[PDB]
């Protein structure tokens, strides 16, 4: 089997991407944020505290003939940005892009933090990191990918995120029309439950490539590129008037600037992030200070290749016995 779904920016900045997901019978379609940095499939629901729902579409298990309470199971998750959610668990039929999993754990939110309530466009998350990070207790649950894997034509999924445009998530096959050149595969460590890999270095604009190992994770659920402070300082030093602002919470730059590209290494290959991808626009409406898309990881404990980086590539998440990541230009 295979599946193929279009993923769409939630706003004009590509803050996140949503992908329609069918849950239940008859189908209830919710727009979920596919997150390769977490392992819970959770949704706004008929159980979510009413004051914490503001425009989201909800899953109502009582309207699904295939929904079953997963008796005694609870979940609670905290993300890198300080947001959180928790609740109870149903199993139900979940389909993505024509690929169906029966008995998928659908984590129904009873409570969500303010940042979820305030985002009317995101109806929940679909985690695609390793199932060792799933938060369901007392019986940990599998991701949608892990449940689909044995049925897929090839044990893979691919992320093809758009810059200010829709893109695609495919399951079970690699669309050889979706990228240019060849795919470079690189090793993955699953020790922290992430798609963790080591980049071979970076360049800023037309500058020399610096060969240096940068461990980090491939995370579709993170908007920006978080790298070591040395690398980030080297990038923003090439932008007149850029500075790190403790008031704003990262590097800002004059909106009048033209940003340089950023290149990262994948083995002997190179992925180039155009400068425009690193513009996240005014810090507040009408400001002439703009927020940068490359930020320091120093206050995180891990480097994160988020959407800024991933959208510059066709990315293969190879879930074979020995997982690997692949990157191609596009």
Ligand X SMILES: CC(C)(C)NC(=O)[C@H]1CCCCN1
Tell which one of 47, 119, 160, 196 touches ligand X (CB under 6 A).
Answer: 119
DSSP string, 200-244: EEEEETTSPPEEEEEEEEE-TT--SEEE-HHHHHHHHTTSTT-EE
Mind telling me the catalytic residues? 35, 199
CB of 85 to ligand X, least distance (A): 9
- The minimum distance between CB 79 and ligand X, in angstroms, equals 4
Applying CB under 6 A, the span of 65-73, 97-105, 114-122, 306-314 interacting with ligand X comes to 114-122
- Given the complex with ligand X, which of 178 and 248 has the nearer CB atom? 248
Of the candidate spans 116-124, 181-189, 257-265, 315-323, the one that interacts with ligand X by CB under 6 A turns out to be 116-124
If binding means CB under 6 A, how many residues of this protein chain bind ligand X? 12
179 vs 291, beta carbon nearer ligand X: 291
Per the document, the length of the chain is 330
Single out the residue of 34, 42, 116, 305 in contact with ligand X (rule: CB under 6 A). 116
Kindly list the distances between the CA atom of residue 133 and the CA atoms of 46, 143, 297, in Å, as whole numbers in the listed order: 26, 10, 21
Site for ligand X in 238-277 (CB under 6 A): none
Burial of 83 from C-beta contacts in 10 A (0-12 / 13-18 / 19+):
middle
Rounded Cα distance, 168 and 256, in Å: 32
C-alpha to C-alpha distance for 83 and 52, rounded to whole angstroms: 13
> Is residue 79 a contact residue for ligand X (CB under 6 A)?
yes
Q: Which of 20, 87, 167, 221 is in the footprint of ligand X by CB under 6 A?
A: 221
Beta strand pairing call for 243-245 and 167-171: unpaired
> Residues near 330 by Cβ (< 8 Å), separated by ≥ 6?
160, 178, 179, 180, 313, 314
Alpha-carbon span 307 to 38, nearest angstrom: 15
- 33, 47, 88, 146: which one binds ligand X (CB under 6 A): 33
Q: Which residues pair with 272 in a beta bridge?
A: 263
The site map against ligand X for 160-189 (x = CB under 6 A) is ------------------------------
Q: Does 123 bind ligand X (CB under 6 A)?
A: no
- In the list 81, 175, 215, 276, the residue contacting ligand X (rule: CB under 6 A) is 81
Residues that bind ligand X (CB under 6 A): 15-16, 33, 35, 79, 81, 83, 115-116, 119, 122, 221
């Amino acid at each position: 089997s295979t599946g193929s779904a279009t993923t769409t920016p939630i706003d004009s900045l590509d803050d996140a991407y949503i992908t329609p997901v069918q849950i239940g019978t008859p189908a209830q379609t919710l727009n979920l944020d596919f997150d390769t940095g977490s392992s819970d499939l959770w949704v706004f629901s008929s159980e979510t505290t009413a004051s914490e729902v503001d425009g989201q579409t909800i899953y109502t298990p009582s309207k699904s003939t295939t929904a079953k309470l997963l008796s005694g199971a609870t979940w609670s998750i905290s993300y890198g940005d300080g947001s959180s959610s928790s609740g109870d668990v149903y199993t139900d039929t979940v389909s993505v892009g024509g690929l169906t999993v029966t008995g998928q754990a659908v984590e129904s939110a009873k409570k969500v933090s303010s940042s979820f309530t305030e985002d009317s466009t995101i109806d929940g998350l679909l985690g695609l990191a390793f199932s060792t990070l799933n938060t369901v207790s007392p019986t940990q649950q599998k991701t949608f990918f892990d449940n689909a894997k044995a049925s897929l034509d090839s044990p893979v999924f691919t992320a093809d995120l758009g810059y200010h445009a829709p893109g695609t998530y495919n399951f079970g096959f690699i669309d050889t029309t979706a990228y240019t050149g060849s795919i470079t595969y690189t090793a993955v460590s699953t020790k922290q439950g992430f798609w963790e890999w080591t980049s071979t270095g970076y360049a800023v604009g037309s500058g020399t490539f610096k060969s240096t190992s940068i461990d980090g994770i491939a995370d579709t659920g993170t908007t920006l590129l978080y790298l070591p402070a040395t690398v980030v300082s080297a990038y923003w030093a090439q932008v007149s008037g850029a500075k790190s602002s403790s008031s704003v919470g990262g590097y800002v730059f004059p909106c009048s600037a033209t940003l340089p590209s950023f290149t990262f290494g994948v083995g002997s290959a190179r992925i180039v992030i155009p400068g425009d991808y690193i513009d996240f626009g005014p810090i507040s409406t009408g400001s002439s200070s703009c927020f940068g898309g490359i930020q320091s990881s120093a206050g995180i404990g891990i480097n994160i290749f988020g959407d800024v980086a991933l959208k510059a590539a066709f990315v293969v998440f190879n879930g074979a016995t020995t997982p690997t990541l692949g990157f191609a230009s596009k």
